[PDB]
């Protein structure tokens, strides 16, 4: 089984930043549909991960769920942080995103930002109350995930 044509098109348009198509297809019913062919990302996951600000904004204004989790337990804030998208992260936080949320492996947005070397994101999450002592299932904190080269992020976290 696959998604409907309409849901496929909405998910694709979100990933693409095609806001006009998102506008045509986004309803209360479809705004939080899931990509059952992939990792069950919602339109907001795709827009957040691919840094599609106009679409992120539209989706949030039309009831997109900042708490929706994909197949691995990621919320859209995880996607924004993993890929270093500062404005998207701020928009998600402004619309109610919780910074201390964790995926199925207990990775938080801050673990993602730290591991990926995204300095500004880490600062933002901290500036917004993220807990730097949260361990994932490996027993690792975000600090533990910082590459040795990244002495500034280390400094930032501890």
């Amino acid at each position: 089984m696959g998604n409907s044509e309409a849901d496929r098109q909405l998910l694709e348009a979100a990933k693409a930043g095609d806001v006009e198509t998102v506008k045509k297809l986004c309803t209360v019913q479809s705004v939080n549909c899931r990509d059952i062919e992939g990792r069950q990302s919602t339109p907001l996951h795709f827009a957040a991960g691919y840094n599609r600000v106009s679409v992120v904004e539209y989706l949030l204004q039309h009831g997109a769920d900042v708490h929706a989790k994909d197949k691995g337990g990621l919320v859209p804030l995880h996607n924004a942080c993993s890929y270093g998208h500062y404005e998207v992260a701020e928009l998600l936080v402004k619309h109610g995103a919780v910074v201390n949320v964790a995926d199925l492996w207990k990775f938080t947005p801050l673990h993602e930002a730290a591991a990926k070397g995204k300095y500004e994101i880490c600062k933002l999450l901290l500036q917004h109350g993220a807990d730097p002592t949260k361990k994932n299932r490996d027993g690792n904190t975000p600090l533990d995930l910082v590459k040795d080269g990244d002495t500034d992020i280390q400094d930032l976290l501890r």
């Binding site: 990933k15 990509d35 992939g38 990792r39 990302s41 996951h45 795709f46 957040a48 991960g49 691919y50 840094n51 994909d70 691995g72 990621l74 995880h78 996607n79 924004a80 993993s82 890929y83 270093g84 998208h85 995926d103 199925l104 492996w105 990775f107 993602e112 990926k116």
Partner: peptide, 12 residues
């Protein structure tokens, strides 16, 4: 097995 989120770092 843990995989990456949908997305990418750079628009270009």
């Amino acid at each position: 097995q843990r995989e990456s989120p949908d997305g990418q770092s750079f628009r270009s």
